[PDB]
Curated annotation (Swiss-Prot):
The chain holds residues 4 to 1045 of 1293 of the full protein. The modification O-(pantetheine 4'-phosphoryl)serine is found at S1003. This is Enterobactin synthase component F. Its cofactor is pantetheine 4'-phosphate. GO terms for cellular component: cytoplasm; cytosol; enterobactin synthetase complex; plasma membrane. Residues 968-1042 form the Carrier domain. Its EC number is 6.3.2.14, 6.2.1.72. It catalyses: 3 2,3-dihydroxybenzoate + 3 L-serine + 6 ATP = enterobactin + 6 AMP + 6 diphosphate + 4 H(+); holo-[peptidyl-carrier protein] + L-serine + ATP = L-seryl-[peptidyl-carrier protein] + AMP + diphosphate. The lineage of its organism: Bacteria, Pseudomonadati, Pseudomonadota, Gammaproteobacteria, Enterobacterales. It is found in: Cytoplasm. The gene is entF. The keyword Transferase applies. It comes from Escherichia coli (strain K12). Proteins EntB, EntD, EntE and EntF are the component of the enterobactin synthase. Components probably do not form a stable complex. EntF acts as a catalytic monomer. Interacts with the MbtH-like protein YbdZ. YbdZ binds to the adenylation domain, but does not alter the structure of the domain. GO terms for molecular function: 2,3-dihydroxybenzoate-serine ligase activity; ATP binding; nucleotidyltransferase activity; phosphopantetheine binding. It comes from the Bacteria.
Amino acid sequence: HLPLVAAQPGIWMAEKLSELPSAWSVAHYVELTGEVDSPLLARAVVAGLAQADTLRMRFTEDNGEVWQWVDDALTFELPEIIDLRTNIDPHGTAQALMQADLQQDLRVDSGKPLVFHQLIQVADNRWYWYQRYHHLLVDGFSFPAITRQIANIYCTWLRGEPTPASPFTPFADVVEEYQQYRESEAWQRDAAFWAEQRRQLPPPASLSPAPLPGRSASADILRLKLEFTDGEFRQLATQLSGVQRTDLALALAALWLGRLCNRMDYAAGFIFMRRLGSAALTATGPVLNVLPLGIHIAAQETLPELATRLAAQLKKMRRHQRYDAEQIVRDSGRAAGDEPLFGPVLNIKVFDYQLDIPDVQAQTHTLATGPVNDLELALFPDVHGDLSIEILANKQRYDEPTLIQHAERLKMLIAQFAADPALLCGDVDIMLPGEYAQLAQLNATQVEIPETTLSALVAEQAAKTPDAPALADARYLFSYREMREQVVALANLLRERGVKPGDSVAVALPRSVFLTLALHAIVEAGAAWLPLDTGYPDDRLKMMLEDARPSLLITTDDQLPRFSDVPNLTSLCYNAPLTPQGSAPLQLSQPHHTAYIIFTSGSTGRPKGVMVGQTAIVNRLLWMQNHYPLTGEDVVAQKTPCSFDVSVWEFFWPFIAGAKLVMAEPEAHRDPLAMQQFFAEYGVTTTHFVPSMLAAFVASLTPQTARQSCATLKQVFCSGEALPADLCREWQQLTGAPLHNLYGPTEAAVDVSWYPAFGEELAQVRGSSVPIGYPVWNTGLRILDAMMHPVPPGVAGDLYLTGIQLAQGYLGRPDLTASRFIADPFAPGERMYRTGDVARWLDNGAVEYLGRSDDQLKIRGQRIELGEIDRVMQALPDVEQAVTHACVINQAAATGGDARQLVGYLVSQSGLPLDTSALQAQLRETLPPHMVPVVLLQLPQLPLSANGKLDRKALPLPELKAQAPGRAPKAGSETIIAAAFSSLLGCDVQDADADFFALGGHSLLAMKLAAQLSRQVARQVTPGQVMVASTVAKLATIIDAE
Ligand SMILES: *P(=O)(O)OCC(C)(C)[C@@H](O)C(=O)NCCC(=O)NCCS[C@@H](CS(=O)(=O)NC[C@H]1O[C@@H](n2cnc3c(N)ncnc32)[C@H](O)[C@@H]1O)[C@@H](N)CO
């Protein structure tokens, strides 16, 4: 007969998507104490339930439409009394009988009845009266009213008086109220208001770092209840007495949640009961609206200013409360399980209701309030000045003990405002005593080290072990003495061509023993080396050389025709040993010199060079040799490309300990089969992987091949991406070789924190990723909120780094240096590096990585600034706008590791169609290859959220079906290869010009392809050949070559 109204349409969609038996059935019991006429109260329950028209409501699926009608024909249960008294000993057997009622399938569709009562005690001078309703029939405001009426009927009968009349308005009058309201000018006014609220609304925020669930949250929750006995709230309200008590508790709760969210602007929910003023006041159905409230903490405001602007908005919201929140959702693009508009939910309405049966005490006890997806906070400031609260919390996102600590923080804020009502919102602190002390000991990493040099340490160790093998590759082997002879000769040669202390020397060499010699010789001259990836395009190397102004480029003879264009550069070809002339040190390098300059992607469109002090890298390497000692039975794998800071400890750490360093062949760092042959062939004990590569390498193994190639490993390090716990566990199962997690941006000296990723320590990680852990020597980790206060354990903050390991700064960019190397407010005169990483302290002191606060990404461990690509794309002709976006194009390629690929979105200035294939060709002239987007898509306009910012979630993925098919694949290699693409990409490939990377392949997936093709033909095909020949037709011609 009638449509679902008010809270029902929201409650309906919410259960359709729920995946639990009774997430939407409210239930509770009342604890009656004394003599009770149970058969009469049974009778009273029946008469009471008849007076609530909404309890006989029946529903039907009207081909999508949903309709309700009250069955005046339905007759009610008499409740069953249960004699469980002098039976089983516990009265928790009754609590089991109640808890068991809610494990049934009580959803509408189950066809079970939606209301249930029964009487239990069974007369132990006490009684448990149990009640459950589906939340489509009842608010938290009407079921205590229904109970009171059953108790009124009961009490009346005892007096010998006729059954009381119903106090209940028909719920139908409510339907008319909204059916008349939805067809009214106030609907158009209310829609317009909430649409402005959406444009201005801050994003959701939660104390849990995990993303907010839009569906299927548990109706079993934590239900904390806390009373504040300190009376500092009493002294607070009376010391202001302009705020309206409730307003004060709200503003405190807003400061408290903002501090736990690490947000100064966030969206929370607020509960309007919608009873007064409505025909619903006396109806029994659910009329209840949780509405979005935009919280804006202002650091410069006082606490009553916060209360005032909040109440102003709550007043304004109250005027428009009739607009169902559910309607706001579909007004926004979001629909059906999409991310919520707010996280926490604030509330003032009561926690219990009373019953006055004569000579009988009654106590309600709540069992199911309904699901809470995140966290909900009820505030009760009494007229007598005490304060109490009730926290409801998702059982998957929180636990009781930490919630108690946070609430004690809420007592601390109250105590702090009690002592200073003029206290600003920004000067308040939620650090418990002894928490700040505990973070002190964690940063107490002071280890006194003498002033020294790489060149010093290397020379000192070659004096100890002249004849121990030091440096080898396929073609050469050098003792520590023979090594120092070649270092000192090249360093003398470098001075003959002008390299002086303080200079830069750029290095563009293939991987051999001579790469290492070149670096040791440069530091020996007192210069700093600058590594060039010759895989970068010509135009980009010109930038780095023009910016760093190196005195000298060391290269090979066939590479310098690329550099004939650079003006005023001097080159040296180095690819064979020099006549020795002793091994004495030159003693030219000094602790304040720069040791090296590694460039990194920079937001402005132009890479920036990070300059690292000689002392900062000495600290890093002496610390490693204390924490993971090497002994010269060790063999270290030079596997990492020289343009990534990780290579530095590979180039230098073995030689300060006496161990051997062995060079891998070129391109072997990206071919997991080649690494297996490498490690076994040289008996490697020590090496490094990026987590994405560890994954590809694990995937290349079985236990037997693991025992054959990794048998010699003793120490493996991992860094540059979040290290997932389960990956470490697969590694432990294959090799038993200890594995360690290291963290650090280039702007400190390679790594500032460590953590064990094996053994007992790994067996304790309950999280998805391994902690980044603990500071190295002379290094501190600061985790600070947006106001640069320190954050307590468990709360997300911005990570800052301190100590001697900090970089000298950005090459030639004193503004960017000032931006990121900021003054440490906790150590005046000292700097502190702003990482851009978000992180939190775990309860054992270790730090957990959580994400970035900016547009920097680690695609497969390699650092990219989406801004760099954006600005380069916008410089292309007829490109007005350009947005780079990282995404997983093809879920079948997410075998493991980071599977993201870069996608450019372009809007043309002219509005004409753009030659995206030519534009992407052009980008390969400017950008390093891993920074060219694999797909460029042109859009008529960029998709925008309600606030006007970019809506990446609306950005269309690339189609796996090209609209312009090419030649079908020819018999032979092309047919094979097509098939292999299909095997790994998960779609049929019948196009010879299909692009492995455009179809969602990535370099880790290329490593699996190369192995598979190398089986399906006798000949080898390298993963590097899949990079170059991106397509079927190109990849075929490479293996058909005769
Ligand atoms: P395909 O051709 O697309 O890929 C093929 C392969 C995998 C072979 C290719 O991707 C490859 O050769 N990759 C090697 C990547 C690599 O070695 N990268 C440099 C190491 S990271 C560097 C610091 S950094 O500034 O570049 N970025 C630091 C930054 O990264 C995050 N981070 C580092 N360590 C972390 C841990 N342990 N957990 C969580 N996050 C971590 C942070 O965001 C940090 O600011 C080195 N200092 C790192 O050791």
